[PDB]
Amino acid sequence: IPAGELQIIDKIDAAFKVAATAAATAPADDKFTVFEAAFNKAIKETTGGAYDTYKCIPSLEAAVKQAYAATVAAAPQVKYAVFEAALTKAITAMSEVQKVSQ
Amino acid sequence: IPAGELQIIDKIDAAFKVAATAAATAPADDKFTVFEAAFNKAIKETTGGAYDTYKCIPSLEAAVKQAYAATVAAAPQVKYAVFEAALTKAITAMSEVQKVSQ
Ligand SMILES: [Mg+2]
Ligand SMILES: [Mg+2]
Numbered sequence: 001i002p003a004g005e006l007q008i009i010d011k012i013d014a015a016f017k018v019a020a021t022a023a024a025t026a027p028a029d030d031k032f033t034v035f036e037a038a039f040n041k042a043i044k045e046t047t048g049g050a051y052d053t054y055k056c057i058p059s060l061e062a063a064v065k066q067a068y069a070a071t072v073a074a075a076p077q078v079k080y081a082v083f084e085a086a087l088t089k090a091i092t093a094m095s096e097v098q099k100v101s102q
Numbered sequence: 103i104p105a106g107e108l109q110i111i112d113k114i115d116a117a118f119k120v121a122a123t124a125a126a127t128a129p130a131d132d133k134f135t136v137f138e139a140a141f142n143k144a145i146k147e148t149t150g151g152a153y154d155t156y157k158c159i160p161s162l163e164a165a166v167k168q169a170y171a172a173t174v175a176a177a178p179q180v181k182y183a184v185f186e187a188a189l190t191k192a193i194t195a196m197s198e199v200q201k202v203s204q
Contacts, residue, residue: 020179024130028123077122078190081183088180 001097005059008047009098012060015042016091020084031080063090103199107161110149111200114162117144118193122186133182165192 001009022038023031040053055061067087071079103111124140125133142155157163169189173181 017179021130024133025127028126031126074187075190075194077119078187081187085176085180085183085187088177092177 001059001094001101005057006098006101008050008057009094011046012043012054012057013091013095015039015046015054016087018042020088023080023084028077028080032083035080035084059094060091063087063094066090103161103196103203107159108200108203110152110159111196113148114145114156114159115193115197117141117148117156118189120144122190125182125186130179130182134185137182137186161196162193165189165196168192 016039019035019039019042023035026034036054043054043057044052051057054064064087067083067090070086071082074082118141121137121141121144125137128136138156145156145159146154153159156166166189169185169192172188173184176184
């Protein structure tokens with residue numbers, strides 16, 4: 001994890017939970033869109049405007065891409081479920097590293 | 103797949119989609135309960151009362167147990183997501199066999 005990103009890992013994890021919660025009650029077809037919108041807003045708010053989107057935090061964008069790649073083979077009905085499970089582990093791994101690094 | 107269960111595979115798949123849809127909008131903490139309740143009702147209705155619960159259809163109960171076992175190592179936030187992804191593949195496999203068997 002790039003030293004420059006360490007300071008915001010805790011915020012990423014918090015924002016992620018917020019976004020996951022937001023998409024939890026959204027209809028199946030709206031989960032990805034709601035998740036992203038919620039994730040971006042939580043990140044923007046929690047980082048004080050340092051980032052406007054998760055796509056702009058290097059390590060996170062990398063994890064999101066990998067989480068999406070995990071959905072390619074998954075059936076439509078569960079692509080989001082597969083995505084969330086994958087991303088949850090990735091972010092939790094970042095959080096663990098951040099906690100022992102600082 | 104036991105010959106006796108073949109006749110209801112299509113109904114299991116349909117009922118599953120109904121239950122997944124039902125739990126899709128339920129709050130995270132209510133997904134498992136809502137899924138099960140919806141699944142049981144859809145099965146009872148679709149099989150004309152032949153079964154009152156998914157736990158009573160041998161092959162399905164087996165798949166549900168395995169799907170749950172897949173959640174043990176998953177974090178709480180995603181246990182249902184992991185469960186649904188696992189069960190979706192299991193049921194789809196049954197459906198594929200049923201379609202070529204009849
Ligand atoms: Mg929640
Ligand atoms: Mg649905």
